[PDB]
Design a protein around this ligand. Structure first.
Ligand SMILES: O=C(NCc1ccccn1)c1cccc(Cl)c1
Ligand SMILES: O=C(NCc1ccccn1)c1cccc(Cl)c1
Ligand SMILES: [Zn+2]
Length: 295
């Protein structure tokens, strides 16, 4: 009746190595980068919204909003200095996605994260839909210029506490983040339209599937497509209040599996089942060593 022979990680692994599973879409959120030292600035425990008094804001969310930013970019860039990572070292989860790419299984990774770790882990622009944008590149805001600047340039400006201005036209330069008040990139909708005709497996890692329209991606899968959640908490189920949600646990469940724990440990377990654990270990050890050894 169903593509998975059982609703377990082992069933998913068996399906993945069957001839029926050729194209995997990953949907990822902040949970895949916390072990890298990047806080989930949507979890209250990080306390982002609490410390934001030194920036003297009209309301807390204005520092994440596009119009305020264009009028007053200094608070955003001071906060960006405060929150700048000490290192950019992707996680076992990120490299698991790189292994998917290497094995010819990765159709697309849709990410909510702006932290660039997918790119550092070796996913290419074509592999990625950065649904909420990214720090990886920045652009002059003037429509007639749009000069692109890499993260190293932006970092130099942020740490020297100089507001980044375009070298060609002296306009403000903004990281390619989707600020509040901007629309998600057109790439998100056009890729969605094409990719979900083609997907054999949805791997949902490190996201509670609460932010829209990203969360709605799980309902774009074909009805037969298995969907594996690797996350500290079960998520994406139909909300009993607000009227294609995940069904892990009912008598009617047939394709959705929940593996509850840290994303790294779930990806290690899945890799072990697939026979990839040594490959993943070697890839992570050498990439981490190269990052640690940046001189
Ligand atoms: O996610 C953030 N900062 C970490 C980071 C990641 C990659 C590159 C630079 N910074 C971040 C979130 C909200 C507001 C600001 Cl201002 C920064
Ligand atoms: O989450 C979003 N953007 C990321 C972000 C990070 C730091 C500062 C501002 N925005 C976002 C924006 C607009 C609509 C939606 Cl649905 C999400
Ligand atoms: Zn410019």
């Amino acid at each position: 009746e169903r593509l998975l022979d059982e609703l377990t990680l082992e069933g998913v692994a068996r399906y993945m190595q069957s001839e029926r599973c050729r194209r995997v879409i990953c949907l990822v959120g902040a949970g895949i980068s916390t072990s890298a030292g990047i806080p989930d600035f949507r979890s209250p425990s990080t306390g982002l919204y609490d410390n934001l008094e030194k920036y003297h804001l009209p309301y807390p969310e204005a520092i994440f909003e596009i119009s305020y930013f264009k009028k007053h970019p200094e608070p955003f860039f001071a906060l960006a200095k405060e929150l700048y990572p000490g290192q950019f070292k992707p996680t076992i989860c990120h490299y698991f996605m790189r292994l998917l790419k290497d094995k010819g299984l990765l159709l697309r990774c849709y990410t909510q994260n702006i932290d660039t770790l997918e790119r550092i882990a070796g996913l290419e622009q074509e592999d990625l839909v950065e649904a909420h944008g990214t720090f990886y590149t920045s652009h002059c805001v003037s429509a007639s210029c749009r000069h692109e600047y890499p993260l190293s340039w932006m970092k130099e400006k942020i740490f020297s506490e100089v507001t980044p201005k375009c070298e060609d036209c002296q306009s403000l330069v903004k990281p390619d983040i989707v600020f509040f008040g901007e629309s998600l990139p057109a790439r998100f909708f056009s890729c969605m339209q094409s990719d979900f005709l083609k997907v054999d497996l949805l791997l949902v890692m490190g996201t509670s599937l609460q932010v829209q329209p990203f969360a709605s991606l799980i309902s774009k899968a074909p009805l037969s497509t298995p969907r594996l959640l690797i996350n500290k908490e079960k998520a994406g189920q139909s909300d009993p209040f607000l009227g294609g949600g995940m069904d892990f646990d009912s008598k009617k469940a047939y394709r959705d599996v929940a593996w509850l724990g840290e994303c790294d440990q779930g990806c290690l377990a899945l890799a072990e089942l697939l026979g990839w654990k040594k490959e993943l270990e070697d890839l992570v050890r050498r990439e981490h060593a190269s990052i640690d050894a940046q001189s």
